[PDB]
Amino acid sequence: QHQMFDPGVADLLDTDILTSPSKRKRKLK
Amino acid sequence: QSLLTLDKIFNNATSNRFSTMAFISSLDILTQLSKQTKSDYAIQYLIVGPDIMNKVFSSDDPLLLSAACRYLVATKNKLMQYPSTNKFVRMQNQYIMDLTNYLYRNKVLSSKSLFGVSPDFFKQILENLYIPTADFKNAKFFTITGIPALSYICIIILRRLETAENTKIKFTSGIINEETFNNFFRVHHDEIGQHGWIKGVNNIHDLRVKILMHLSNTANPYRDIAAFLFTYLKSLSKYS
């Protein structure tokens, strides 16, 4: 698993965009 | 110098060669000031603080790194008559040990810190950083051929050395590292063993020394990095 963010800051950052493209597509339009 | 190094014009992403020209002009004036013995200036006016020097060491500009090495060479040759333990002599010692470790030693992870940063973070950046070949990952790109400003420069120098000696063998790989060097000797072992490549070189360290010989010639604006490596290295002190 590519944990790009530090665990201290990944809690408040929504990482679910990379896993689910539908979340990104509904956060664009 | 304080205004020039701010990350609003002089960055590692949005480049500005104007700021680099102003910085190397300031470094040239500092080198020409350090050679004047007759003027009794204060010793504190030749340092610029660590925060400028480590930042410009981190910057990927070969002319700027050459000017920084020139500044270090000048300030050490001025500081040799000064006492060996002052507030700024150990500062210059920190500068040269960090720069030599980043440039030739490849011992960054074993050091206490690099440019004021401990090597645990420097290793953690290497973690999750995918490399296609994991033969030698922690020492591949932390050297004279691994510097972003000096990676392809060493390849140009190697190609010119191949052309000068009329070698039938050309270094096909586009990166000079230990893995590529070992693979290059592995693929053409019997040709390397007899004739057809750069003479007097058998390892990657000898290749770096032979590169440093060509950077010391009177054809490049990168004289000062070769002199810096030839000065503050007892192994390279005989090549001056």
Curated annotation (Swiss-Prot), chain A:
Q: Where does it live in the cell?
A: Nucleus; Chromosome, Centromere, Kinetochore
Question: What family name appears in the similarity comment?
Answer: Belongs to the CENP-O/MCM21 family.
Q: What does this protein do?
A: Component of the kinetochore, a multiprotein complex that assembles on centromeric DNA and attaches chromosomes to spindle microtubules, mediating chromosome segregation and sister chromatid segregation during meiosis and mitosis. Component of the inner kinetochore COMA complex, which connects centromere-associated proteins and the outer kinetochore. COMA interacts with other inner kinetochore proteins to form the inner kinetochore constitutive centromere-associated network (CCAN), which serves as a structural platform for outer kinetochore assembly.
- Quaternary data: Component of the heterotetrameric kinetochore subcomplex COMA, which consists of AME1, CTF19, MCM21 and OKP1. The COMA subcomplex is part of a larger constitutive centromere-associated network (CCAN) (also known as central kinetochore CTF19 complex in yeast), which is composed of at least AME1, CHL4, CNN1, CTF3, CTF19, IML3, MCM16, MCM21, MCM22, MHF1, MHF2, MIF2, NKP1, NKP2, OKP1 and WIP1. COMA binds the centromeric nucleosome-binding protein MIF2, and to the outer kinetochore MIND subcomplex.
The extra comment attached to this record reads:
Present with 952 molecules/cell in log phase SD medium.
Q: What is this protein called?
A: Inner kinetochore subunit MCM21
The UniProt gene name for this protein comes to: MCM21
UniProtKB/Swiss-Prot annotation, chain B:
Q: Where in the cell is it found?
A: Nucleus; Chromosome, Centromere, Kinetochore
Task: Describe the task this protein carries out.
Answer: Component of the central kinetochore, which mediates the attachment of the centromere to the mitotic spindle by forming essential interactions between the microtubule-associated outer kinetochore proteins and the centromere-associated inner kinetochore proteins. Required for establishing bipolar spindle-microtubule attachments and proper chromosome segregation.
Anything further noted? Present with 319 molecules/cell in log phase SD medium.
Q: How does it assemble?
A: Component of the heterotrimeric kinetochore subcomplex CTF3, which consists of CTF3, MCM16 and MCM22. The CTF3 subcomplex is part of a larger constitutive centromere-associated network (CCAN) (also known as central kinetochore CTF19 complex in yeast), which is composed of at least AME1, CHL4, CNN1, CTF3, CTF19, IML3, MCM16, MCM21, MCM22, MHF1, MHF2, MIF2, NKP1, NKP2, OKP1 and WIP1. Interacts with CTF19. Interacts with CHL4.
Q: Which family does it belong to?
A: Belongs to the CENP-I/CTF3 family.
* Protein name from the UniProt record: Inner kinetochore subunit CTF3
Q: From the entire protein, which fragment is shown?
A: 490 to 729 of 733
